[model samples]
Target chain A: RRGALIVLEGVDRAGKSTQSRKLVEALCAAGHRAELLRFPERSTEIGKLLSSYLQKKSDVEDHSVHLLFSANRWEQVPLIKEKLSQGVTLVVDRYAFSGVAFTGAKENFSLDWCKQPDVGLPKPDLVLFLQLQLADAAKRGAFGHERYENGAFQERALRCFHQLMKDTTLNWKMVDASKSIEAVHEDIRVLSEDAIATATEKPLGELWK
Target chain B: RRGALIVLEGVDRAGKSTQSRKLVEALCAAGHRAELLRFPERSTEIGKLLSSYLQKKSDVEDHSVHLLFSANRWEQVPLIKEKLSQGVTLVVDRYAFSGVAFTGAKENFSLDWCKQPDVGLPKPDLVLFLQLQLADAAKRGAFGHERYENGAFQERALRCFHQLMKDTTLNWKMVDASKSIEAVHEDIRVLSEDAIATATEKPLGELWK
Candidate 1:
């Protein structure tokens, strides 16, 4: 069987890391090789820049932060492709959408602008967008040090996410992250299982042009 | 007059810095305001990290480097916009194409993948491509302690720059860096004057996405 590239996306405190781990463990336990990857994966040179941008130590000039986050993901394309070739289920905490929506939220640089840089990329088999309210996300203690973890920016970002949903195609699922973590996790599982069960033969699509 | 986003692209030792300084100086001499900004503009926090990545002090994953370079541009978006709004002519030593081409020359990522992060940016009014032969660039002795400065990479990067050219709409003026420095600078002077003369009517276009 071919491996699947599965992605989970949302603002901070959406429980993406936790749920992504759960999904990877589940896939492994079920005899499927799985790996979890995160954007701004902070170990690399670019990741360090992203880390500083997130921390108060760096002042991110809005567009710069978004591109940094996107670049962090671009570095992983080959690995993701290789893992898929090995039949290892790949899980991403965030992918192009985070790059798009988060950066698109900034003014002057429209959504279409943010979507441009991600022209050709390996599209995921499924995009599990964790939908959470700004108020709920705040309650989850998400704001620690990252640059965009503010009330105003997240609020704008959610609007951008909604806009992105209209353009997303099949294999795109939105889960209510405002609910309990277990419940959200279950929702992802229910949808994800069906997606895995009925896989398609299409190769990955580019993020945008 | 609105501000113009000007980019100087070519092989590393193609005299981008010298010409950029000359251009800025000329603009100032003409009683116009301009600033010469270099990429990996290593003064900022992000720039420092980028410097580390370039120096190999830190390992910047391919995706990470591309994103950081793109993000570095993003950080300047607002400032770019503001300066343009105030009719400040902006001279960039390197911009999106440099990041895309430099990283695109690497393994794993393709030319298209490298172009993703810089989708939407303030497009340059004029892209003065300082074209130079690899051997000629080697003779200039502009050695640096960075990763992309070797002979093979420079040759590869020159080709990558060609590929990048196929993807943009900016007015490309190819200056021969193989000629004397003063000769190339003269070529730049002639083109820049024309662009500067009409900077107002042409509002800046957004980068790719």
Candidate 2:
């Protein structure tokens, strides 16, 4: 019984972290081995650099920092694979899509370029897209702490996120993040459990393979 | 008349630096405004980190370092574009191809992944591949100073370089670097002058676009 590789993706303040934590708790409460993870896994050295760039403490070219984000993901593959093989379900707060969408949405940055480095990386068994209107999301909080938190950037990233749906290979399940936190969590809980219970027995797929 | 963006690419010890310098001198003597440039620029902040990784004074994941290399190039784009616009020919010692070839050759690294970040970057008007057999290159120097100086790595990198040539858009001219310095320089000199003289009247092309 392999564990499910579940990923949560959305724009800023889309309740990804909150929902991811709730979903993990639900999985555990339901007697499944589950753990939570997040990207820009800022504890590592690569993540430190990515954090600097994200916080505007340092300036890096878009293309360079984009790869760093991908590298941050790659660094976790071994641990991710290990946990999954041990039947511990992993709920990732964000994954490759954000890397592509956020950077690709910037002016003159292509989605294809943003996606290239992540090719052949571990594919999520389920991608819970916590979709929210930019207006709704922006109203949730102050949006200027990081390099990509503004409305204009969020609007562009949202479009790229929608474009990511063109790939039929990823198991995408859209969730309305604008709903009350409990309601969205329940929805994610149900879908994620179903995904875990009926998880594929085949080998894990790679991104953009 | 815009200047030519000429790149030299090959395995280690393929005489890229030596020939690039010679080419720059010849261009100057022939009254062309030419200069030499190298990647892992090794001076800027990013380049400093890259140098640390290459020197093994610090460790970085393959993907992270690979992006660092691309960022290194991206940092120079403004200067590269400025010089070319001013009709100052650039005889670059190495460029994106080296970034892709060497890193992509590593185990578990994809060539396409390595190339993605460099797309839309200024394409070289001429790429002089100083081709040399791995055995010949090894005979030219001792290995082990740099992380990628060993025979197996060079062999793998050489294969990737060959694979890079499949793209017809890149204006590639293969030079056998096993020849005497003067002979190789003469060959490169002739090909380069022609490339510079009849350089594309069109705008600079992007790496893969």
Candidate 3:
């Protein structure tokens, strides 16, 4: 039986990082063969550019950055495919869902244009999108000092995320990010455990189709 | 009027570089603000990966490298468009055509699927194809040191390049690479000068329709 691919997805500062970490910890503490990975796998050759651009807004254009993010994920697919086939649960901190929502939110960039490059990637068995408002995400820490961290962009991105959720074929689950950290973890942990068990009986899937 | 986008495309070591350099020199010596560019820009962040992958027959997979090559070109569009608008003729050593042809030649990769990420890129004013048989190509330089330089892979890629040429929308010209180096450049220079003149009258176009 192959392991499940569980992905944590949401807008910036929606606590995906927090929950993704804790879920992996809890899964492994219960003896699941689980590991964590992040998109824009910043250590990768393509990723350093993604990292630099996100830090200061690229001298790089938005569309180019979008493709870079897509390329970065594509680069990891071979290993990702192998690991899951070997029965290791891989928890991604963020996946293509975030890429589409964030980049497609920009003006002059359409959702269809953004979706093309990432179309054939390995699909997740379960995706947890932490829903949080811009108002609340604004209150967290440093106020989105990164290039795309402002209010207007995030608000636009929220709408894009909603658009993605409308696609009924994906195994998307909505979790409220306004909850306390412990409450959120409990919510994610239950959904993920069941997904892990269920994926063993079902075959893998392809993304954005 | 903006400058023209001129591209040199063909199988490996088919004198694209020899002609590309000569074409740029002839254009500039006659007083045009012309410059040369190449896809898989090996100096850029995305390019170093592409360069290494081609050299090592890398740990990287073919599909992933194809996206990287496509992404590498996407990364440069900002600057390329800027130069063209400022009226600088850009002679590219290679572009997405090479990316599509080389990678799509591999088993299981489709031309349509390979064309997706590159579909919206800037179309060339003129694309010069250097046609040389693989039997003759084997006679030049060191024999097949890179990942994709083998006869079987190149023979497959040659067919893919022909598939690209069949599209009537693109301004493609085929030059026999069996000609002397000087004769090939003469053919390229005349096509490029006419392209430069034509682009000033016609607006730019998007790639792959």
Candidate 4:
């Protein structure tokens, strides 16, 4: 029985980390093998480079930056596959979708290009997009601290994320991030279990093509 | 007049570096402003990562390495575009074709996916494939000092390069690299001039759109 790959995707301070940690804890507390993982792991060589870029201590060019982010996720697949194979449900915070959506938001950068590097990545069984309105997101504490923390970019990325999630074939749930933390976690917990049940019944799916 | 982007693609030890330098010198002697360039540039952030990978001191997984190489190229487009626009012909050794051919040579890794990151790069006015048999290449010196220098991989990459150059829409010239260095340089110089003339008469074209 393989564990489901569950991904929580969203902008900065959208409670993805919170929900991810809670979901893993709930899964484990219920006696299910589960773990919490995050993208841009920040421990790898590529991730280290990306951290500098993200922190604005250094810079990554627009064209190369997307690949850097993609490379970071790509490097983690071996472990990710290994963890899920051992029947451990992986609650991932930020993922391949984040790389595509953020980079695709740039003017003239098509989603197709950003999607290439992450093609063949281990596809998630359930993808919950924790979408927060920029108006509400702006009110969140510590906004604009990171490099990509801004209204203009977030608005563009939200549109890109919406466009990406338009596909009906995949398991994509749109969640309102303005809800109470417990309420959002409750909604996520249900879907996580629902996905975990089916994951044990089917073979793993790959991203894009 | 705009300058031509001329690229030389071949397997390891194919004398691409030798020919590239000679071409630039010939262009300069002929009163043309020209500069020699190389890929996996080994200086920038992405290039630095690639250097370690190539040296075998560090390893980059196949899934992410092609992007690293492509990112190295993408990072240099600003300088490449500027040099060409300012009337300096760029004689490049090992461009996007090298990344694709090398990565695509791996079993089950299609060239199509490898081609994505480099889709919109600056298309070369002339691509001279320095064709050399692996047997002859092995005789040239320091064959296996670097990574990706074995005969098995070289054979696979050679086939990939041939398959890629089969596209008749672009200007691709095959040179018998087993010939003398002077012979190859003369053949390259003639094509270089031919491409330079047309590049001045026409605007630069974007790569595989």
Reference-based lDDT, each prediction: 0.77, 0.87, 0.86, 0.87
Model 4 DockQ, alpha carbons vs. true complex: 0.76
lDDT of 2 by residue, B1-209 (tens): 88999999976788898999999999899999999999979998778888998888998767667877887898888889899989989999889999999998899787877888788889999999997877787788687687887777888988899999998999999999999998999999999999888774777778888
Docking class of 1: medium
Model 1 residue B6 lDDT score: 82
Stretch of 10 with least lDDT, candidate 1 chain A: A200-209
Candidate 1: residue A132 Cα off by (Å): 6.8
Interface C-alpha RMSD per candidate, 1 decimal: 2.8, 2.0, 1.8, 0.9
Q: Candidate 1, residues A1-209: lDDT per residue as tens digits?
A: 55778889876788889899888787778777778898869996667867776777777677666676666676777887777777777888887787777777777767766775565667778888887766777788657656677878887887887788787463678788888877877788767666665543555555643
Pull out the clashing pairs in model 3: none
TM per candidate comes to 0.74, 0.90, 0.93, 0.96
Error of 2 at A16 (Å): 1.2
Clashes of 2: 0
Candidate closer to the true structure by TM-score (higher is better), 3 or 4: 4
Model 4, range A70-170, lDDT digits (tens) per residue? 88887888988999899999999989888988998898899998899888889899999997866676677866567878877877888888888986757
Q: How many backbone clashes does candidate 3 have?
A: 0
- On a 0 to 100 scale, what is the lDDT of residue A90 in model 2? 95
- Fnat for candidate 4 (0 to 1): 0.63
Chain A TM-score for candidate 2 is 0.96
Q: What is the Cα-based lDDT of residue A14 in candidate 4?
A: 84
Better of 1 and 3 by lDDT: 3
